[PDB]
């Protein structure tokens, strides 16, 4: 089938879970999936723990990433390194789905060029589906997306 | 950019020229193009003569193709051989545009499986543009196409 781009944005909770839920279904179906998490959690990775043993490549941002204004050079460089993996995936004809978790902040803080993104998305293997997660998704990215679900928080605990 | 699928259909004259005109522009721009002509002309190939020396691969149906009812087996086999080239092109990340001239008759006479077509189109490299020419284009193909121009014959000589 033709791979599409899906975006899970908005301020509501479940963006990441949605993306991992899709991935889970894909794997359950025998598809090849690759994952990039631009934001390293200070906890244990349930999703990774689950999926990884199933041949799902995982790429997580380095611990060293600081988000500090005076560290833009180093942080940009760490983001670039992790995104290299992402571009590679976005170039793999054998990967049925690619997950770019928390990609929106990387763009929103200018740690990665939107243009590289657009380009990478555009040139991907036709059967490839890509899932983008994160609050405040860049409009240009939304314009390119096939599906956009906005998690609106009706209530939050 | 994102490669699209363009269809030049209808009964008006210029379907092929349109497709070659697009190809000419692409080459003029430095793009890589590949061509498949499902129908062998009994004349000299102006387009081929022109484009070929520019590194444009050309794939023409074998002379042996008959269109004869009692030769479906052999003709199907010749079509399949030529289409193998087409699928290959439709799989090349380095080809910016692929031209499938007179592809509509191959589908319309069942010499090539529409399903193989849809599939090949769907899985192509994201930056790839494909041009399909021919009268009576299968609807399913039209549904998948980004642009569809129908050559309506207002007058004919
Ligand atoms: Cl979540
Ligand atoms: Cl013509």
PDB file of C-alpha atoms and ligand atoms in Angstrom:
ATOM      1  CA  UNK A   1       0.000   0.000   0.000  1.00  0.00           C
ATOM      2  CA  UNK A   2       1.027   3.556  -0.087  1.00  0.00           C
ATOM      3  CA  UNK A   3       2.808   4.683   3.110  1.00  0.00           C
ATOM      4  CA  UNK A   4       1.346   7.816   4.699  1.00  0.00           C
ATOM      5  CA  UNK A   5       2.488  10.363   7.292  1.00  0.00           C
ATOM      6  CA  UNK A   6       0.530  10.549  10.455  1.00  0.00           C
ATOM      7  CA  UNK A   7       0.796  13.243  13.053  1.00  0.00           C
ATOM      8  CA  UNK A   8      -0.180  12.983  16.668  1.00  0.00           C
ATOM      9  CA  UNK A   9      -0.071  16.437  18.069  1.00  0.00           C
ATOM     10  CA  UNK A  10      -2.074  18.778  20.478  1.00  0.00           C
ATOM     11  CA  UNK A  11      -1.626  19.231  24.176  1.00  0.00           C
ATOM     12  CA  UNK A  12      -3.563  16.189  25.190  1.00  0.00           C
ATOM     13  CA  UNK A  13      -1.802  13.131  26.730  1.00  0.00           C
ATOM     14  CA  UNK A  14      -1.418   9.917  24.604  1.00  0.00           C
ATOM     15  CA  UNK A  15       0.555  11.270  21.567  1.00  0.00           C
ATOM     16  CA  UNK A  16       3.442   8.897  22.164  1.00  0.00           C
ATOM     17  CA  UNK A  17       1.238   6.008  23.189  1.00  0.00           C
ATOM     18  CA  UNK A  18      -0.734   6.459  19.965  1.00  0.00           C
ATOM     19  CA  UNK A  19       2.440   6.234  17.921  1.00  0.00           C
ATOM     20  CA  UNK A  20       3.662   3.222  19.883  1.00  0.00           C
ATOM     21  CA  UNK A  21       0.246   1.625  19.632  1.00  0.00           C
ATOM     22  CA  UNK A  22       0.453   1.905  15.804  1.00  0.00           C
ATOM     23  CA  UNK A  23       3.918   0.475  15.842  1.00  0.00           C
ATOM     24  CA  UNK A  24       2.795  -2.362  18.055  1.00  0.00           C
ATOM     25  CA  UNK A  25       0.026  -3.248  15.593  1.00  0.00           C
ATOM     26  CA  UNK A  26       2.506  -3.060  12.663  1.00  0.00           C
ATOM     27  CA  UNK A  27       4.938  -5.404  14.409  1.00  0.00           C
ATOM     28  CA  UNK A  28       2.075  -7.704  15.434  1.00  0.00           C
ATOM     29  CA  UNK A  29       1.349  -7.798  11.691  1.00  0.00           C
ATOM     30  CA  UNK A  30       4.902  -8.755  10.727  1.00  0.00           C
ATOM     31  CA  UNK A  31       5.957  -5.303   9.408  1.00  0.00           C
ATOM     32  CA  UNK A  32       9.445  -3.791   9.918  1.00  0.00           C
ATOM     33  CA  UNK A  33       9.518  -0.740  12.117  1.00  0.00           C
ATOM     34  CA  UNK A  34      12.167   1.718  13.185  1.00  0.00           C
ATOM     35  CA  UNK A  35      12.096   4.153  15.986  1.00  0.00           C
ATOM     36  CA  UNK A  36      13.732   7.473  16.945  1.00  0.00           C
ATOM     37  CA  UNK A  37      12.958   9.144  20.269  1.00  0.00           C
ATOM     38  CA  UNK A  38      14.306  12.644  20.282  1.00  0.00           C
ATOM     39  CA  UNK A  39      13.648  12.948  23.963  1.00  0.00           C
ATOM     40  CA  UNK A  40      15.340  10.672  26.465  1.00  0.00           C
ATOM     41  CA  UNK A  41      13.067   9.785  29.463  1.00  0.00           C
ATOM     42  CA  UNK A  42      14.600   9.546  32.870  1.00  0.00           C
ATOM     43  CA  UNK A  43      12.791   6.284  33.283  1.00  0.00           C
ATOM     44  CA  UNK A  44      12.786   2.742  32.005  1.00  0.00           C
ATOM     45  CA  UNK A  45      11.493   2.376  28.437  1.00  0.00           C
ATOM     46  CA  UNK A  46       8.429   0.173  28.521  1.00  0.00           C
ATOM     47  CA  UNK A  47       7.911   0.509  24.779  1.00  0.00           C
ATOM     48  CA  UNK A  48      11.508  -0.211  24.037  1.00  0.00           C
ATOM     49  CA  UNK A  49      11.511  -3.057  26.418  1.00  0.00           C
ATOM     50  CA  UNK A  50       8.610  -4.514  24.569  1.00  0.00           C
ATOM     51  CA  UNK A  51       9.366  -3.827  20.941  1.00  0.00           C
ATOM     52  CA  UNK A  52      13.097  -3.989  20.776  1.00  0.00           C
ATOM     53  CA  UNK A  53      13.340  -7.792  21.203  1.00  0.00           C
ATOM     54  CA  UNK A  54      11.105  -7.993  18.131  1.00  0.00           C
ATOM     55  CA  UNK A  55      13.787  -6.562  15.857  1.00  0.00           C
ATOM     56  CA  UNK A  56      12.644  -3.004  16.123  1.00  0.00           C
ATOM     57  CA  UNK A  57      15.617  -0.678  15.945  1.00  0.00           C
ATOM     58  CA  UNK A  58      15.525   2.029  18.674  1.00  0.00           C
ATOM     59  CA  UNK A  59      17.374   5.278  18.541  1.00  0.00           C
ATOM     60  CA  UNK A  60      17.235   7.518  21.654  1.00  0.00           C
ATOM     61  CA  UNK A  61      18.709  10.914  22.113  1.00  0.00           C
ATOM     62  CA  UNK A  62      21.998  10.952  24.104  1.00  0.00           C
ATOM     63  CA  UNK A  63      21.827  11.636  27.836  1.00  0.00           C
ATOM     64  CA  UNK A  64      24.197  14.451  27.320  1.00  0.00           C
ATOM     65  CA  UNK A  65      21.468  16.587  25.599  1.00  0.00           C
ATOM     66  CA  UNK A  66      20.927  19.672  27.874  1.00  0.00           C
ATOM     67  CA  UNK A  67      18.341  22.052  26.353  1.00  0.00           C
ATOM     68  CA  UNK A  68      20.519  24.815  27.735  1.00  0.00           C
ATOM     69  CA  UNK A  69      20.727  28.074  25.821  1.00  0.00           C
ATOM     70  CA  UNK A  70      24.512  28.176  26.138  1.00  0.00           C
ATOM     71  CA  UNK A  71      24.837  24.669  24.899  1.00  0.00           C
ATOM     72  CA  UNK A  72      23.090  24.978  21.573  1.00  0.00           C
ATOM     73  CA  UNK A  73      26.222  23.852  19.721  1.00  0.00           C
ATOM     74  CA  UNK A  74      26.675  20.656  21.503  1.00  0.00           C
ATOM     75  CA  UNK A  75      22.948  19.860  21.810  1.00  0.00           C
ATOM     76  CA  UNK A  76      22.433  20.606  18.127  1.00  0.00           C
ATOM     77  CA  UNK A  77      25.288  18.247  17.352  1.00  0.00           C
ATOM     78  CA  UNK A  78      23.706  15.431  19.530  1.00  0.00           C
ATOM     79  CA  UNK A  79      20.340  15.972  17.809  1.00  0.00           C
ATOM     80  CA  UNK A  80      22.062  15.824  14.375  1.00  0.00           C
ATOM     81  CA  UNK A  81      23.752  12.577  15.271  1.00  0.00           C
ATOM     82  CA  UNK A  82      20.495  10.923  16.339  1.00  0.00           C
ATOM     83  CA  UNK A  83      18.654  12.321  13.245  1.00  0.00           C
ATOM     84  CA  UNK A  84      21.282  10.765  10.979  1.00  0.00           C
ATOM     85  CA  UNK A  85      19.763   7.458  12.107  1.00  0.00           C
ATOM     86  CA  UNK A  86      16.330   8.861  11.311  1.00  0.00           C
ATOM     87  CA  UNK A  87      17.356   9.871   7.801  1.00  0.00           C
ATOM     88  CA  UNK A  88      18.806   6.512   7.296  1.00  0.00           C
ATOM     89  CA  UNK A  89      15.526   4.894   8.260  1.00  0.00           C
ATOM     90  CA  UNK A  90      13.586   7.277   6.131  1.00  0.00           C
ATOM     91  CA  UNK A  91      15.737   5.958   3.309  1.00  0.00           C
ATOM     92  CA  UNK A  92      15.166   2.259   3.972  1.00  0.00           C
ATOM     93  CA  UNK A  93      13.056   0.479   1.441  1.00  0.00           C
ATOM     94  CA  UNK A  94      12.681  -2.352   3.808  1.00  0.00           C
ATOM     95  CA  UNK A  95      11.239  -0.391   6.710  1.00  0.00           C
ATOM     96  CA  UNK A  96       7.466  -0.329   6.630  1.00  0.00           C
ATOM     97  CA  UNK A  97       7.104   2.272   9.309  1.00  0.00           C
ATOM     98  CA  UNK A  98       9.274   4.815  10.963  1.00  0.00           C
ATOM     99  CA  UNK A  99       8.456   6.442  14.309  1.00  0.00           C
ATOM    100  CA  UNK A 100       9.838   9.936  15.008  1.00  0.00           C
ATOM    101  CA  UNK A 101       8.778  10.525  18.661  1.00  0.00           C
ATOM    102  CA  UNK A 102       8.984  14.038  20.036  1.00  0.00           C
ATOM    103  CA  UNK A 103      10.283  15.282  16.763  1.00  0.00           C
ATOM    104  CA  UNK A 104       8.180  18.476  17.040  1.00  0.00           C
ATOM    105  CA  UNK A 105      10.398  19.975  19.882  1.00  0.00           C
ATOM    106  CA  UNK A 106      13.577  19.386  17.850  1.00  0.00           C
ATOM    107  CA  UNK A 107      12.026  21.621  15.159  1.00  0.00           C
ATOM    108  CA  UNK A 108      10.493  24.005  17.564  1.00  0.00           C
ATOM    109  CA  UNK A 109      13.826  24.749  19.221  1.00  0.00           C
ATOM    110  CA  UNK A 110      15.763  24.735  15.986  1.00  0.00           C
ATOM    111  CA  UNK A 111      17.990  21.718  16.888  1.00  0.00           C
ATOM    112  CA  UNK A 112      17.203  20.220  13.433  1.00  0.00           C
ATOM    113  CA  UNK A 113      16.454  21.909  10.124  1.00  0.00           C
ATOM    114  CA  UNK A 114      12.793  21.669   9.105  1.00  0.00           C
ATOM    115  CA  UNK A 115      14.018  21.561   5.521  1.00  0.00           C
ATOM    116  CA  UNK A 116      15.917  18.310   6.175  1.00  0.00           C
ATOM    117  CA  UNK A 117      12.731  16.930   7.534  1.00  0.00           C
ATOM    118  CA  UNK A 118      10.534  17.853   4.705  1.00  0.00           C
ATOM    119  CA  UNK A 119      13.086  16.540   2.301  1.00  0.00           C
ATOM    120  CA  UNK A 120      13.568  13.264   4.188  1.00  0.00           C
ATOM    121  CA  UNK A 121       9.791  12.719   4.381  1.00  0.00           C
ATOM    122  CA  UNK A 122       9.318  13.506   0.724  1.00  0.00           C
ATOM    123  CA  UNK A 123      11.952  11.182  -0.636  1.00  0.00           C
ATOM    124  CA  UNK A 124      10.992   8.152   1.462  1.00  0.00           C
ATOM    125  CA  UNK A 125      10.154   4.746   0.086  1.00  0.00           C
ATOM    126  CA  UNK A 126       6.572   4.894  -1.242  1.00  0.00           C
ATOM    127  CA  UNK A 127       5.279   2.060   1.017  1.00  0.00           C
ATOM    128  CA  UNK A 128       6.654   3.792   4.060  1.00  0.00           C
ATOM    129  CA  UNK A 129       4.461   5.111   6.816  1.00  0.00           C
ATOM    130  CA  UNK A 130       5.880   7.641   9.175  1.00  0.00           C
ATOM    131  CA  UNK A 131       4.481   8.684  12.570  1.00  0.00           C
ATOM    132  CA  UNK A 132       5.385  12.090  14.015  1.00  0.00           C
ATOM    133  CA  UNK A 133       4.641  12.965  17.615  1.00  0.00           C
ATOM    134  CA  UNK A 134       4.804  16.084  19.653  1.00  0.00           C
ATOM    135  CA  UNK A 135       3.018  19.242  20.800  1.00  0.00           C
ATOM    136  CA  UNK A 136       3.124  22.256  18.442  1.00  0.00           C
ATOM    137  CA  UNK A 137       3.857  20.508  15.218  1.00  0.00           C
ATOM    138  CA  UNK A 138       5.324  22.828  12.607  1.00  0.00           C
ATOM    139  CA  UNK A 139       2.613  23.825  10.064  1.00  0.00           C
ATOM    140  CA  UNK A 140       4.692  22.934   7.143  1.00  0.00           C
ATOM    141  CA  UNK A 141       4.927  19.464   8.563  1.00  0.00           C
ATOM    142  CA  UNK A 142       1.186  19.387   9.076  1.00  0.00           C
ATOM    143  CA  UNK A 143       0.690  20.409   5.459  1.00  0.00           C
ATOM    144  CA  UNK A 144       2.650  17.464   4.263  1.00  0.00           C
ATOM    145  CA  UNK A 145       0.904  14.953   6.625  1.00  0.00           C
ATOM    146  CA  UNK A 146      -1.863  12.554   5.448  1.00  0.00           C
ATOM    147  CA  UNK A 147      -3.514  12.318   8.801  1.00  0.00           C
ATOM    148  CA  UNK A 148      -3.499  14.684  11.661  1.00  0.00           C
ATOM    149  CA  UNK A 149      -5.103  13.885  14.952  1.00  0.00           C
ATOM    150  CA  UNK A 150      -4.948  16.613  17.572  1.00  0.00           C
ATOM    151  CA  UNK A 151      -5.045  15.416  21.157  1.00  0.00           C
ATOM    152  CA  UNK A 152      -7.128  17.896  22.891  1.00  0.00           C
ATOM    153  CA  UNK A 153      -7.088  17.667  26.625  1.00  0.00           C
ATOM    154  CA  UNK A 154     -10.659  17.640  27.861  1.00  0.00           C
ATOM    155  CA  UNK A 155      -9.437  16.677  31.399  1.00  0.00           C
ATOM    156  CA  UNK A 156      -6.056  15.954  32.868  1.00  0.00           C
ATOM    157  CA  UNK A 157      -4.901  14.244  36.140  1.00  0.00           C
TER     158      UNK A 157
ATOM    159  CA  UNK B   1      10.147  17.423  -3.844  1.00  0.00           C
ATOM    160  CA  UNK B   2       7.536  14.803  -3.699  1.00  0.00           C
ATOM    161  CA  UNK B   3       7.235  12.802  -6.950  1.00  0.00           C
ATOM    162  CA  UNK B   4       3.705  12.616  -8.357  1.00  0.00           C
ATOM    163  CA  UNK B   5       1.886  10.468 -10.926  1.00  0.00           C
ATOM    164  CA  UNK B   6       0.610  12.193 -13.970  1.00  0.00           C
ATOM    165  CA  UNK B   7      -1.758  10.740 -16.493  1.00  0.00           C
ATOM    166  CA  UNK B   8      -2.197  11.835 -20.055  1.00  0.00           C
ATOM    167  CA  UNK B   9      -5.241  10.114 -21.350  1.00  0.00           C
ATOM    168  CA  UNK B  10      -8.383  10.811 -23.571  1.00  0.00           C
ATOM    169  CA  UNK B  11      -8.763  10.318 -27.271  1.00  0.00           C
ATOM    170  CA  UNK B  12      -7.090  13.516 -28.276  1.00  0.00           C
ATOM    171  CA  UNK B  13      -3.650  13.503 -30.005  1.00  0.00           C
ATOM    172  CA  UNK B  14      -0.539  14.654 -28.007  1.00  0.00           C
ATOM    173  CA  UNK B  15      -0.608  12.176 -25.039  1.00  0.00           C
ATOM    174  CA  UNK B  16       2.825  10.817 -25.866  1.00  0.00           C
ATOM    175  CA  UNK B  17       4.236  14.174 -26.863  1.00  0.00           C
ATOM    176  CA  UNK B  18       3.066  15.579 -23.524  1.00  0.00           C
ATOM    177  CA  UNK B  19       4.902  12.846 -21.663  1.00  0.00           C
ATOM    178  CA  UNK B  20       8.020  13.296 -23.783  1.00  0.00           C
ATOM    179  CA  UNK B  21       7.785  17.048 -23.399  1.00  0.00           C
ATOM    180  CA  UNK B  22       7.847  16.610 -19.580  1.00  0.00           C
ATOM    181  CA  UNK B  23      10.764  14.271 -19.851  1.00  0.00           C
ATOM    182  CA  UNK B  24      12.585  16.696 -22.089  1.00  0.00           C
ATOM    183  CA  UNK B  25      12.159  19.468 -19.511  1.00  0.00           C
ATOM    184  CA  UNK B  26      13.347  17.115 -16.714  1.00  0.00           C
ATOM    185  CA  UNK B  27      16.475  16.176 -18.663  1.00  0.00           C
ATOM    186  CA  UNK B  28      17.053  19.825 -19.605  1.00  0.00           C
ATOM    187  CA  UNK B  29      16.988  20.386 -15.833  1.00  0.00           C
ATOM    188  CA  UNK B  30      19.588  17.710 -15.094  1.00  0.00           C
ATOM    189  CA  UNK B  31      17.147  15.076 -13.724  1.00  0.00           C
ATOM    190  CA  UNK B  32      17.477  11.310 -14.373  1.00  0.00           C
ATOM    191  CA  UNK B  33      14.724   9.841 -16.475  1.00  0.00           C
ATOM    192  CA  UNK B  34      13.791   6.369 -17.605  1.00  0.00           C
ATOM    193  CA  UNK B  35      11.476   5.343 -20.319  1.00  0.00           C
ATOM    194  CA  UNK B  36       9.308   2.338 -21.258  1.00  0.00           C
ATOM    195  CA  UNK B  37       7.294   2.313 -24.481  1.00  0.00           C
ATOM    196  CA  UNK B  38       4.880  -0.558 -24.455  1.00  0.00           C
ATOM    197  CA  UNK B  39       4.099  -0.012 -28.084  1.00  0.00           C
ATOM    198  CA  UNK B  40       6.770  -0.313 -30.745  1.00  0.00           C
ATOM    199  CA  UNK B  41       6.290   2.200 -33.643  1.00  0.00           C
ATOM    200  CA  UNK B  42       7.053   1.084 -37.133  1.00  0.00           C
ATOM    201  CA  UNK B  43       9.013   4.256 -37.551  1.00  0.00           C
ATOM    202  CA  UNK B  44      12.178   5.933 -36.389  1.00  0.00           C
ATOM    203  CA  UNK B  45      12.068   7.127 -32.770  1.00  0.00           C
ATOM    204  CA  UNK B  46      12.516  10.875 -32.758  1.00  0.00           C
ATOM    205  CA  UNK B  47      12.175  11.047 -28.985  1.00  0.00           C
ATOM    206  CA  UNK B  48      14.576   8.225 -28.462  1.00  0.00           C
ATOM    207  CA  UNK B  49      16.938   9.674 -30.929  1.00  0.00           C
ATOM    208  CA  UNK B  50      16.916  12.857 -28.974  1.00  0.00           C
ATOM    209  CA  UNK B  51      16.875  11.748 -25.371  1.00  0.00           C
ATOM    210  CA  UNK B  52      18.822   8.557 -25.413  1.00  0.00           C
ATOM    211  CA  UNK B  53      22.243  10.197 -25.974  1.00  0.00           C
ATOM    212  CA  UNK B  54      21.509  12.152 -22.793  1.00  0.00           C
ATOM    213  CA  UNK B  55      21.671   9.041 -20.624  1.00  0.00           C
ATOM    214  CA  UNK B  56      17.993   8.328 -20.714  1.00  0.00           C
ATOM    215  CA  UNK B  57      17.400   4.598 -20.622  1.00  0.00           C
ATOM    216  CA  UNK B  58      14.840   3.456 -23.254  1.00  0.00           C
ATOM    217  CA  UNK B  59      12.895   0.264 -23.118  1.00  0.00           C
ATOM    218  CA  UNK B  60      10.701  -0.599 -26.146  1.00  0.00           C
ATOM    219  CA  UNK B  61       8.415  -3.516 -26.575  1.00  0.00           C
ATOM    220  CA  UNK B  62       9.859  -6.347 -28.738  1.00  0.00           C
ATOM    221  CA  UNK B  63       8.976  -6.410 -32.433  1.00  0.00           C
ATOM    222  CA  UNK B  64       7.683  -9.860 -31.956  1.00  0.00           C
ATOM    223  CA  UNK B  65       4.593  -8.561 -30.023  1.00  0.00           C
ATOM    224  CA  UNK B  66       1.511  -9.506 -32.166  1.00  0.00           C
ATOM    225  CA  UNK B  67      -1.734  -8.444 -30.433  1.00  0.00           C
ATOM    226  CA  UNK B  68      -3.177 -11.641 -31.841  1.00  0.00           C
ATOM    227  CA  UNK B  69      -5.825 -13.459 -29.838  1.00  0.00           C
ATOM    228  CA  UNK B  70      -4.108 -16.809 -30.356  1.00  0.00           C
ATOM    229  CA  UNK B  71      -0.816 -15.438 -29.248  1.00  0.00           C
ATOM    230  CA  UNK B  72      -1.748 -14.165 -25.824  1.00  0.00           C
ATOM    231  CA  UNK B  73       0.844 -16.419 -24.182  1.00  0.00           C
ATOM    232  CA  UNK B  74       3.762 -15.213 -26.086  1.00  0.00           C
ATOM    233  CA  UNK B  75       2.647 -11.559 -26.217  1.00  0.00           C
ATOM    234  CA  UNK B  76       1.945 -11.586 -22.489  1.00  0.00           C
ATOM    235  CA  UNK B  77       5.425 -12.968 -21.945  1.00  0.00           C
ATOM    236  CA  UNK B  78       7.009 -10.153 -24.124  1.00  0.00           C
ATOM    237  CA  UNK B  79       5.008  -7.525 -22.207  1.00  0.00           C
ATOM    238  CA  UNK B  80       6.152  -9.069 -18.877  1.00  0.00           C
ATOM    239  CA  UNK B  81       9.758  -8.949 -19.966  1.00  0.00           C
ATOM    240  CA  UNK B  82       9.579  -5.266 -20.909  1.00  0.00           C
ATOM    241  CA  UNK B  83       7.637  -4.430 -17.677  1.00  0.00           C
ATOM    242  CA  UNK B  84      10.385  -6.049 -15.607  1.00  0.00           C
ATOM    243  CA  UNK B  85      12.486  -3.085 -16.757  1.00  0.00           C
ATOM    244  CA  UNK B  86       9.649  -0.785 -15.732  1.00  0.00           C
ATOM    245  CA  UNK B  87       9.449  -2.284 -12.252  1.00  0.00           C
ATOM    246  CA  UNK B  88      13.112  -1.945 -11.933  1.00  0.00           C
ATOM    247  CA  UNK B  89      12.897   1.739 -12.769  1.00  0.00           C
ATOM    248  CA  UNK B  90       9.992   2.216 -10.464  1.00  0.00           C
ATOM    249  CA  UNK B  91      12.335   0.881  -7.806  1.00  0.00           C
ATOM    250  CA  UNK B  92      15.260   3.191  -8.555  1.00  0.00           C
ATOM    251  CA  UNK B  93      15.938   5.816  -5.972  1.00  0.00           C
ATOM    252  CA  UNK B  94      18.106   7.588  -8.404  1.00  0.00           C
ATOM    253  CA  UNK B  95      15.540   7.995 -11.160  1.00  0.00           C
ATOM    254  CA  UNK B  96      13.673  11.263 -10.874  1.00  0.00           C
ATOM    255  CA  UNK B  97      11.078  10.407 -13.446  1.00  0.00           C
ATOM    256  CA  UNK B  98       9.810   7.332 -15.132  1.00  0.00           C
ATOM    257  CA  UNK B  99       7.811   7.367 -18.376  1.00  0.00           C
ATOM    258  CA  UNK B 100       5.382   4.491 -19.036  1.00  0.00           C
ATOM    259  CA  UNK B 101       4.160   5.250 -22.606  1.00  0.00           C
ATOM    260  CA  UNK B 102       1.111   3.415 -23.878  1.00  0.00           C
ATOM    261  CA  UNK B 103       0.826   1.573 -20.642  1.00  0.00           C
ATOM    262  CA  UNK B 104      -2.996   1.878 -20.703  1.00  0.00           C
ATOM    263  CA  UNK B 105      -3.393  -0.697 -23.612  1.00  0.00           C
ATOM    264  CA  UNK B 106      -1.238  -3.258 -21.773  1.00  0.00           C
ATOM    265  CA  UNK B 107      -3.794  -3.067 -18.933  1.00  0.00           C
ATOM    266  CA  UNK B 108      -6.747  -2.802 -21.175  1.00  0.00           C
ATOM    267  CA  UNK B 109      -5.883  -6.025 -22.984  1.00  0.00           C
ATOM    268  CA  UNK B 110      -4.763  -7.816 -19.861  1.00  0.00           C
ATOM    269  CA  UNK B 111      -1.100  -8.277 -20.977  1.00  0.00           C
ATOM    270  CA  UNK B 112       0.018  -6.974 -17.535  1.00  0.00           C
ATOM    271  CA  UNK B 113      -1.642  -7.241 -14.137  1.00  0.00           C
ATOM    272  CA  UNK B 114      -3.140  -3.955 -12.931  1.00  0.00           C
ATOM    273  CA  UNK B 115      -2.262  -5.088  -9.423  1.00  0.00           C
ATOM    274  CA  UNK B 116       1.461  -5.157 -10.282  1.00  0.00           C
ATOM    275  CA  UNK B 117       1.061  -1.659 -11.511  1.00  0.00           C
ATOM    276  CA  UNK B 118      -0.652  -0.274  -8.539  1.00  0.00           C
ATOM    277  CA  UNK B 119       1.855  -1.948  -6.320  1.00  0.00           C
ATOM    278  CA  UNK B 120       4.852  -0.726  -8.333  1.00  0.00           C
ATOM    279  CA  UNK B 121       3.499   2.848  -8.340  1.00  0.00           C
ATOM    280  CA  UNK B 122       2.781   2.765  -4.639  1.00  0.00           C
ATOM    281  CA  UNK B 123       6.155   1.541  -3.498  1.00  0.00           C
ATOM    282  CA  UNK B 124       8.230   3.913  -5.636  1.00  0.00           C
ATOM    283  CA  UNK B 125      10.880   6.248  -4.326  1.00  0.00           C
ATOM    284  CA  UNK B 126       9.098   9.268  -2.803  1.00  0.00           C
ATOM    285  CA  UNK B 127      10.832  11.842  -5.078  1.00  0.00           C
ATOM    286  CA  UNK B 128       9.816   9.898  -8.134  1.00  0.00           C
ATOM    287  CA  UNK B 129       7.456  11.267 -10.724  1.00  0.00           C
ATOM    288  CA  UNK B 130       5.800   8.878 -13.075  1.00  0.00           C
ATOM    289  CA  UNK B 131       4.030   9.705 -16.355  1.00  0.00           C
ATOM    290  CA  UNK B 132       1.408   7.314 -17.736  1.00  0.00           C
ATOM    291  CA  UNK B 133       0.090   7.656 -21.261  1.00  0.00           C
ATOM    292  CA  UNK B 134      -2.670   6.070 -23.205  1.00  0.00           C
ATOM    293  CA  UNK B 135      -6.354   6.143 -24.152  1.00  0.00           C
ATOM    294  CA  UNK B 136      -8.813   4.517 -21.709  1.00  0.00           C
ATOM    295  CA  UNK B 137      -6.757   4.619 -18.587  1.00  0.00           C
ATOM    296  CA  UNK B 138      -7.939   2.131 -15.986  1.00  0.00           C
ATOM    297  CA  UNK B 139      -9.979   3.939 -13.270  1.00  0.00           C
ATOM    298  CA  UNK B 140      -8.041   2.458 -10.495  1.00  0.00           C
ATOM    299  CA  UNK B 141      -4.969   3.975 -12.036  1.00  0.00           C
ATOM    300  CA  UNK B 142      -6.731   7.302 -12.348  1.00  0.00           C
ATOM    301  CA  UNK B 143      -7.668   7.126  -8.679  1.00  0.00           C
ATOM    302  CA  UNK B 144      -4.083   6.797  -7.685  1.00  0.00           C
ATOM    303  CA  UNK B 145      -2.856   9.614 -10.028  1.00  0.00           C
ATOM    304  CA  UNK B 146      -2.026  13.157  -8.780  1.00  0.00           C
ATOM    305  CA  UNK B 147      -2.795  14.822 -12.045  1.00  0.00           C
ATOM    306  CA  UNK B 148      -5.012  13.756 -14.825  1.00  0.00           C
ATOM    307  CA  UNK B 149      -5.264  15.650 -18.048  1.00  0.00           C
ATOM    308  CA  UNK B 150      -7.716  14.280 -20.585  1.00  0.00           C
ATOM    309  CA  UNK B 151      -6.910  15.058 -24.196  1.00  0.00           C
ATOM    310  CA  UNK B 152     -10.176  15.736 -25.734  1.00  0.00           C
ATOM    311  CA  UNK B 153     -10.157  15.930 -29.471  1.00  0.00           C
ATOM    312  CA  UNK B 154     -11.921  19.107 -30.513  1.00  0.00           C
ATOM    313  CA  UNK B 155     -10.680  18.617 -34.140  1.00  0.00           C
ATOM    314  CA  UNK B 156      -8.499  16.055 -35.812  1.00  0.00           C
ATOM    315  CA  UNK B 157      -6.624  15.976 -39.194  1.00  0.00           C
TER     316      UNK B 157
HETATM  317 CL1  LIG C   1       1.782   9.657  25.849  1.00  0.00          CL
HETATM  318 CL1  LIG C   2       1.162  12.019 -29.430  1.00  0.00          CL
END
